[PDB]
Amino acid sequence: SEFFPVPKPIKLNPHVELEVFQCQDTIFQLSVIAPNAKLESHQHPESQIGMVLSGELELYIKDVIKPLRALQDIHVADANVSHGFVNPLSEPMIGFDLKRITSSLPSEDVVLTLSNNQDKITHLPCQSVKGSWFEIVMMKIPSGYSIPPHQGEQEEIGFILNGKLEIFIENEEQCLEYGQIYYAPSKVLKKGYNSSNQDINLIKILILE
């Protein structure tokens, strides 16, 4: 559905498997890169951001190499900037990226790092960073916690890394698990509830937009 998009699996090559979700003007994908493998350098008109969820990656961008740490660093490739990746480990790299045509001034950075902050809506501790067209927020949703109803100007894509989280977007409800995402268009009502016995790690991307 629009709010709970069904992904399309793509076997890109024998070392790269994708799950591709469309969220209106944004394409979101979960990627799995095989041990010691590569995603060869390319360019495209869409701006791109992403993070490693498990494993490690080396970002080849412009004239440099930047290491990307799981759940910490975000790569930032502006429109038509050449970028590629190498998996330096003997373990798979599981990550995500978002692609969108943006009309923003260039980013000062090709890599960003999440830092400690406090989430506006929940007042819970989070790790976040703001870039030129996006903000990424990672936060723990404690067992039993209800994310209160909220509606924003910004589009939001989110997903969880573990457990099961109830998410309501407008009139639709779904119990989300890793491998699924939610998408809340501008001005749509979102709310959620962790009815599980575990703390759930949630990642959201706010599109600025």
Q: Which is nearer to Fe ion, 7 or 84 (CB)?
A: 84
Closer Cβ to Fe ion, 48 or 87, answer by number: 48
Between 51 and 126, name the residue whose CB sits nearer to Fe ion. 51
Q: Which is nearer to Fe ion, 12 or 34 (CB)?
A: 12
Q: How far is the CB of 42 from Fe ion (least distance, A)?
A: 6
- Residue closer to Fe ion by CB (options 48, 107) is 48
What is the C-alpha separation between 51 and 159, in angstroms, rounded? 13
- Give the footprint of Fe ion on residues 69-98 (CB under 5 A): none
CB 54 within 8 A of CB 93: yes
Q: Give the end-to-end CA distance of the chain in Å, rounded to a whole number.
A: 21
Q: Measured from the CB atom, is 43 or 115 closer to Fe ion?
A: 43
| Distance of closest approach, residue 155 Cβ to Fe ion, in angstroms | 20
Beta carbon of residue 191, minimum distance to Fe ion (angstroms, whole number): 33
Report which residue's Cβ sits closest to Fe ion: 48
In a 3-state reduction of DSSP, which class is residue 2?
A: coil
* Closest separation in Å from C-beta 169 to Fe ion: 28
- Least separation in angstroms between CB 165 and Fe ion: 29
Q: Whole-angstrom Cα distance, residue 46 to residue 18?
A: 18
Vertex 151 angle, CA 150 and 154, to 5°: 125
Residues from 34 through 53 that contact Fe ion (CB under 5 A): 48
What does the buried/exposed string (b/e) look like for 151-190 if buried means 16 or more CB atoms within 10 Å of the residue's CB? eeeebbbbbbeebebbbbbeeeeeebebebbbbbeeebeb
Pick out residues in 146-185 that bind Fe ion (CB under 5 A).
none
Residues binding Fe ion: what is the number (CB under 5 A)? Answer: 1
Q: Cα–Cα distance between 179 and 64 in angstroms, integer?
A: 31
Q: 3-state class of 107 per DSSP? A: coil
The position carrying tokens 């109830």 is: 166
Least separation, in Å, of the C-beta of 83 and Fe ion?
Answer: 6
Residues that bind Fe ion (CB under 5 A): 48
